[PDB]
Ligand binder design. Structure first.
Ligand SMILES: Cc1cc2nc3c(=O)[nH]c(=O)nc-3n(C[C@H](O)[C@H](O)[C@H](O)COP(=O)(O)OP(=O)(O)OC[C@H]3O[C@@H](n4cnc5c(N)ncnc54)[C@H](O)[C@@H]3O)c2cc1C
Ligand SMILES: Cc1cc2nc3c(=O)[nH]c(=O)nc-3n(C[C@H](O)[C@H](O)[C@H](O)COP(=O)(O)OP(=O)(O)OC[C@H]3O[C@@H](n4cnc5c(N)ncnc54)[C@H](O)[C@@H]3O)c2cc1C
Ligand SMILES: NC(=O)c1cc(N2CC2)c([N+](=O)[O-])cc1[N+](=O)[O-]
Ligand SMILES: NC(=O)c1cc(N2CC2)c([N+](=O)[O-])cc1[N+](=O)[O-]
Ligand SMILES: [Zn+2]
Ligand SMILES: [Zn+2]
Ligand SMILES: [Zn+2]
Lengths: 230, 230
């Protein structure tokens, strides 16, 4: 019954284009009767650094610190910092996780990279057995809503930036698919700073309109072929 | 005709494999007579978040905050946070910048992503126009020294992770090349955790051995063909 959505938002300005895309998502999904939660990373002063402060109590090896081993153990022993577990609860209950962010160096802003590094720990999002198709977050949907500085023409195979699917690889495949997420087609709003009002409105409207039927969408085939193939 | 090297290092543990690769680089480059500087991000508690705290002067637009616009202006006016300018000084003087880090979600750890986001600002690393082959850091060399959890086999075209070059795209092309850097071949030390003592010592020695002749190397053609073929 019903659907739960978590929006992980990474922009410093509420009045930004990203802020508007996040607000439109909240409005539309809320109108549909969906349960909606937003993790406004900058407003939360979310910690991006992976450090030993992410484990409470005593480390499984206070001699040599291995973040991966320590957090996996901490997860299984319920000894992770509360900011991390708070995010994990949101992800665990979510049916769909939308990431809203401006492209920073062909990737996500560092504060959001930190959310991924720290929240998607072994035991919670993946394990030796459960990864990719068997990812622990299988059954969940993920969607990247990104805005860019460069134009769509620049993001083509022969363009200066290469195809946008090229930079999506680490995020959609290396991260989301690895954790079991079914990946919905990305929403890319190209160069809003350069675009005109009519175009910007069209972009936000396209996002809102798309959200009207997001639950009918089928995941993309998150494969090397989709990202690089023909 | 000496050379200056900056190693941007991102690992929490001095006794780690990454720590050993960083130390081997310092040892060998120092032995060669090179000038060496290391930015130990975790030890420095380096700030990864791109926020308005990065600008100390009067904002160009105090109503709507745009990180790119404000940092570009702040760079020109010299009102950027000192931690950013401290890093820019190191980069400006360096002939070669080596990034030493463990792969985190097919990318760099968030603390290092933050270094890229905040240090490589407009006016310093690139201009518009003034990117890719016209980037402001032209004449400089960059090299990614990465360690992984996955094995070399997993990081091949037919591997579950796809070819290792795929995840290098956002970093080598979208970031380094965009800023004008000539990119030297990446050094990828695969699955040291699974490797045996002998195999690990071998990977470290291979890195040190390569550094002996690093100044005779040619950069790679940082193109889509190099990364994806086809
Ligand atoms: C460190 C850093 C690295 C970057 N790396 C890359 C990169 O690798 N590749 C790349 O392509 N780009 C890159 N960029 C560009 C960056 O992605 C863009 O600046 C950003 O995505 C633009 O959107 P943003 O600020 O929301 O837009 P705003 O600048 O917030 O949006 C543009 C305009 O939209 C208007 N607007 C807001 N709400 C609405 C609304 N509801 N309806 C209509 N208009 C509205 C605003 O007032 C504004 O004038 C980088 C930027 C930084 C700071
Ligand atoms: C949040 C997160 C995300 C990750 N994402 C990915 C991913 O997307 N893809 C992927 O492949 N991996 C991923 N990993 C795996 C991670 O990259 C590896 O754990 C790491 O790179 C291993 O190296 P590191 O800790 O130095 O190794 P250590 O664990 O530091 O090294 C392994 C062994 O090397 C030994 N050693 C150290 N120095 C020497 C020396 N001089 N001679 C001989 N032995 C030595 C150590 O004692 C240790 O037993 C991720 C990890 C985390 C925490
Ligand atoms: N419009 C573009 O060329 C552009 C602009 C910026 N800018 C203003 C912040 C960045 N970038 O910073 O990485 C990257 C690109 N990019 O396309 O590759
Ligand atoms: N050894 C591996 O399979 C491995 C381990 C991890 N781990 C421990 C953090 C990650 N990863 O998290 O993305 C990825 C891989 N990878 O190969 O694709
Ligand atoms: Zn995939
Ligand atoms: Zn390139
Ligand atoms: Zn390239």
């Amino acid at each position: 019954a019903g659907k739960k959505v978590l929006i992980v938002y990474a922009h410093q300005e509420p009045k930004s284009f990203n802020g508007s895309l996040k607000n439109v998502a909240v409005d539309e999904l809320s109108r549909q009767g969906c349960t909606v939660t937003v993790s406004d990373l900058y407003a939360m002063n979310f910690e991006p650094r992976a450090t030993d402060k992410d484990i409470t109590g005593t480390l499984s090896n206070p001699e040599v610190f291995n973040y991966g081993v320590e957090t996996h153990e901490a997860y299984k022993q319920r000894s992770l910092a509360s900011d991390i577990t708070d995010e994990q609860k949101k992800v665990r209950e979510a049916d769909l996780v939308i990431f809203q962010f401006p492209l920073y160096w062909f990737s996500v802003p560092a504060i959001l990279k930190g959310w991924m590094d720290r929240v998607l720990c072994q035991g919670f999002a993946f394990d030796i057995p459960g990864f990719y198709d068997s990812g622990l977050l299988q059954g969940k949907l993920a969607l990247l809503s990104v805005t860019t500085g460069g134009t769509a023409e620049m993001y083509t195979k022969t363009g200066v930036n290469g195809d946008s699917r090229y930079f999506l690889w680490p995020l959609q495949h290396g991260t989301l698919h690895f954790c079991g997420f079914k990946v919905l087609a990305p929403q890319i709003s190209f160069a809003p700073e350069i675009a005109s009002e009519e175009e910007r409105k069209g972009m936000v409207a396209a996002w809102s309109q798309r959200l009207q039927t997001i639950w009918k969408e089928e995941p993309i085939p998150c494969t090397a072929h989709w990202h690089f193939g023909q």
